[PDB]
């Protein structure tokens, strides 16, 4: 089997992407944030504290003839950005782009943090990291991909995120029309539960390539590119007037600037992030200070190849017995 679904930016900055997901019988379609940095499929629901729901579409398990309470199971998650959610668990039928999993754990939120409430466009998350990170207790549950994998034509999914435009998540096949040149594959460590890999270096603009190993994670659920402070300083030094602002919470730059590109290495291959992908716009409405899309990972504890990086590539998440990651230009 295969599946193919369009993923759509939630706003004009590509702050996140939402993908429609069918849950239950009859289908209830929710727009979920596909997150290769976590491993829980959780939704706003009829159980979510009413004051914490503000415009989201909810899953109502009592209206699904295939929903079953997973007795005694609870979940609770905290994300790198400080947001969180928790609740109980149902199993139900879940379909993405024509690919159906029966008996998928659907984690129903009883509580969500303010950041989730305040974002009316995201009805929940669909985790695509390794199932070892799943938070369900006392019986850990599998991700949608893990459940689907054996049925897929090939045990892979691909992320093809758009810049200021829709893109595609495919399951079970590689669309050879969706990228240019070849796909370069690179080793993955699953030791921390992430799609963790090592970039071979970077360049700023038309500058020379610096060969240096940068361990980090491919994370569709993180907006920005978080890299070591040395790399980030080298980038922003090429933008007149850019500075790190403790008050704003990262590098800012004059909105009048033209940003240089940023290149990262995948083996001997190179992925170029155009300068415009690194612009996250005014820090507040009407400001002439703009927020940068490349930020320091210092104090996160891990480097994160988030959407800024991934949307410059066609990315293969290869879930074979020994997982790997592939990147192609597009």
UniProtKB/Swiss-Prot annotation:
GO terms for biological process: proteolysis. Keywords: Aspartyl protease, Disulfide bond, Hydrolase, Protease, Signal, Zymogen. Residues 17-328 form the Peptidase A1 domain. Disulfide bonds join 255-290. The keyword Signal applies. Its EC number is 3.4.23.22. The keyword Protease applies. The active site is at 35, 199. Coiled coil: none annotated. It catalyses: Hydrolysis of proteins with specificity similar to that of pepsin A, prefers hydrophobic residues at P1 and P1', but does not cleave 14-Ala-|-Leu-15 in the B chain of insulin or Z-Glu-Tyr. Clots milk. GO terms for molecular function: aspartic-type endopeptidase activity. It comes from the Eukaryota. Belongs to the peptidase A1 family. This is Endothiapepsin. It comes from Cryphonectria parasitica (Chestnut blight fungus). The gene is EAPA. The chain holds residues 90 to 419 of 419 of the full protein.
């Amino acid at each position: 089997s295969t599946g193919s679904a369009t993923t759509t930016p939630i706003d004009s900055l590509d702050d996140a992407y939402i993908t429609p997901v069918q849950i239950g019988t009859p289908a209830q379609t929710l727009n979920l944030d596909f997150d290769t940095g976590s491993s829980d499929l959780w939704v706003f629901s009829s159980e979510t504290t009413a004051s914490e729901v503000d415009g989201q579409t909810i899953y109502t398990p009592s209206k699904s003839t295939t929903a079953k309470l997973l007795s005694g199971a609870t979940w609770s998650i905290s994300y790198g950005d400080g947001s969180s959610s928790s609740g109980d668990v149902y199993t139900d039928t879940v379909s993405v782009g024509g690919l159906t999993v029966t008996g998928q754990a659907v984690e129903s939120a009883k509580k969500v943090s303010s950041s989730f409430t305040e974002d009316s466009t995201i009805d929940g998350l669909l985790g695509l990291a390794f199932s070892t990170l799943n938070t369900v207790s006392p019986t850990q549950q599998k991700t949608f991909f893990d459940n689907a994998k054996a049925s897929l034509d090939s045990p892979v999914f691909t992320a093809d995120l758009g810049y200021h435009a829709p893109g595609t998540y495919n399951f079970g096949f590689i669309d050879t029309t969706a990228y240019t040149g070849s796909i370069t594959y690179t080793a993955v460590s699953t030791k921390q539960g992430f799609w963790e890999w090592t970039s071979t270096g970077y360049a700023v603009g038309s500058g020379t390539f610096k060969s240096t190993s940068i361990d980090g994670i491919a994370d569709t659920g993180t907006t920005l590119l978080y890299l070591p402070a040395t790399v980030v300083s080298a980038y922003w030094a090429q933008v007149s007037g850019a500075k790190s602002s403790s008050s704003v919470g990262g590098y800012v730059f004059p909105c009048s600037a033209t940003l240089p590109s940023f290149t990262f290495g995948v083996g001997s291959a190179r992925i170029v992030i155009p300068g415009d992908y690194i612009d996250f716009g005014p820090i507040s409405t009407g400001s002439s200070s703009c927020f940068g899309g490349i930020q320091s990972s210092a104090g996160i504890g891990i480097n994160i190849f988030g959407d800024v990086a991934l949307k410059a590539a066609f990315v293969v998440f290869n879930g074979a017995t020994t997982p790997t990651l592939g990147f192609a230009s597009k």
